[PDB]
């Protein structure tokens, strides 16, 4: 077979992708065998750092003790290997002894996957000629979640896993995200129990035609501006000042790159998983959760949305509809775990539990920690709206308390002074469940609720 | 109009990139204007350091004098922008006072961007400052900056070769001899039997005669034209390091740190202060197909995807055992090697292959696109050392799998490999010294087979086999 002229850029595809992301973080490794030994390491108690690049076919890592891998001297043994032809089947490093002055490889580990990760291996030392009783076993840390970082005291979490707050944070989403595409007869039914989204006749669709100009946009910013109020009267919840950057590369940042996979302030991006039987929601969701996306999407809305010329544009309903539908969607997904999904009118008591603090449904979403910090972050821009206007239009918005809430008198930059709750606004803890029960089945008669509109750019 | 449903992800194109390009770096900045000051520095002696990612759409940064930049503590002035709508024509940002305890910015920066075509560094940003503080109640402030991009150092300005050594490299014997080694064995399979006859008549085809080793026909992995290109390059290993010391890279440069992650780092990467840094791809005007091939495999995705993919292969054992001494070597060639010069180049028109006017021979004409001048380029030595070294772990690799199948041999003075079962003949090809059966090298003959040889946007010698893949 004739061999290639040339090469060329050899980005990893979809297989190579998602091998890299099943080796990418830190494992926990022990030595097995009559012959197991490492110079200058035990035999148990050691750990494997590796990392991919998004498209790279290169692996890199380093394998020492715990406290070594932390530490600012080289750890004892690098990491080099290739994903070429690599699979579960089949995965092949070499290990370069840093103790020794030489890059010459010491090692050479071939590794399966036994099916967060398990692999199971080999090791030949390359001083001795091919036998060795030389294997060892590692297994992949857990991806900690935001709720084993972050913990929300008794009292906040009391409130956020109740079934009204539960059911009432679904159903004001779900009212006014499916409006514009109910019938006459979902419509007066939800008018009937006053769970339309804003004022009866005149309500504000947040995803019809006229989203942008109908002030949907300030049910939005209004309504979560509410949510944080009551959630920091029982607990400090600070708002992100800055996104969260994506983890540094274990090329750059040995010790900063471990420790993002230990999620220790509850801001590392979870890893992407892959949905079996949806590709498109794969691709998707692994775009969303990458460092492209960060520098494409997230820091772009990060400046525009703190830019005076850009909000200055904006009436608080447009400012209120764009983040929302762009940015506020997106940063939920970037930053969900695990769960396959509830069917949004499925009432199952397990969905009730506080385990359940999926980002991906609003019926959970609240209860995960990162929720308050990312909305915190929205919250701060109406600040930043509100001075952008008062540098380019000085007067034309003026403060005023609306329920309780620091908010802003209608005018010039914001078209209504109504903005909705729920029925408290517009329309027993027991009837009230079963009526906000009865508005979603109203509504409703596989992917996450966030997910729901997912498009892929052509790219993808 | 409707405004977008839903987000997707928005890659800059290659506007953006290439804007991105433009801003990604170190710049002198100066602020002008009778209201220009900003708080704790000074007008004039300032930088500003910018960032774009790959196909990011952001754009940040950092604006303190040059010694803060470089400095453990957070710089004076952040930069937060973004290239939504943005051209040569308009560059916006923010700037954040770090010192204030607030991310809420302090100025509106808005630039315009100028191309340099004739001092005055690399490109110009220049425009106008505005307080945010400072009510609209207020008058016009006077509030502007200029900034010059600084110049990316070249390697030869980083690592000076000796006046021995450099003596040598850009003679008209080496120049001439390089280029024609190279191009008699990459051009035989294309020549007609009237230019080899003519090849054979002065010495210069490649190999032994009537059996010669092309580089690049249908048998270039089987025919050991593989020895003739390790070889060769270890001959001119050993003499090039008689004259001057030239430590092989033990490991590939990785590409630079962004800023978010080491600024001190990112900004030293600018000063190139160990010769290895890559130079930024540059736009070939009217030749997209090469700046995008180019811009590919100067990039980290290359480093990640192909680079790194060769530092393994070329050091597992398992992967050399496979291949003979010809095979490994035809392989590193047509691959890895024509990427190492075209990642490392900067910016020389491309000199005509048969162009012998006597300003191409001057120790200036180092680019690394053409083997008239690539050995001249101190770069050049660091990786060649690197594919050197790389015999040694083919050897070791035979050894374990294939112990006593290959045995070392002294030839032409050089520490090297008897013919086997892995080493596919026992006569390299330095040229006529080796092979030569005609009808010091004469500079003349040279000039005359390379006539023989080289009897359209253009494009460098290194850059000739480019292919994109399908994604670029």
Known sequence: PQTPDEASLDLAATDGIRLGDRLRGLWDLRLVGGDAELPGLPREGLQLVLDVAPKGRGLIGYLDTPERLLAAEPPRFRVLGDL????????????????????????????????????????????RSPNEDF???????????????????????????????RLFHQLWHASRDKWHRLSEKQRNALRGVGWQPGPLDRERDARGPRKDRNASGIDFFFMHRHMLHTARSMQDLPSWERLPRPVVPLEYDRPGFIRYF?????????????AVDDDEYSEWLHGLKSAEAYHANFLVWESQYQDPAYLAKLTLGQFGSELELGMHDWLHMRWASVTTDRFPADFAPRWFRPENDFLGDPFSSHVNPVFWSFHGWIDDRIEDWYRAHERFHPGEVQRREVEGIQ??????????????????????VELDVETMKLALRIIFSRRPWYARNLKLARDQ
């Open 135 to 165: 294997r060892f076993v590692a297994v992949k840390r857990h991806f900690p979640l935001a709720h084993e970082r972050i913990v929300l005291n008794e009292k906040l979490l009391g409130w956020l896993v109740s079934p009204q707050h």
């Open 407 to 428: 908010w802003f008198a209608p005018g010039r930059w914001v078209e209504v002074g109504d903005p909705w709750l729920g029925p408290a606004t517009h329309g027993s």
């Open 84 to 127: 070429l032809g690599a699979s579960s089947a089949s995965i092949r490093w070499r290990l370069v002894d840093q103790a020794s002055g030489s890059v010459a490889p010491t090692h050479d580990c071939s590794a399966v996957f036994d099916e967060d990760g398990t692999l199971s291996g080999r090791i030949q030392r390359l001083e």
């Open 262 to 274: 230990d999620n220790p302030d509850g801001f590392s991006v979870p890893p992407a998983w892959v």
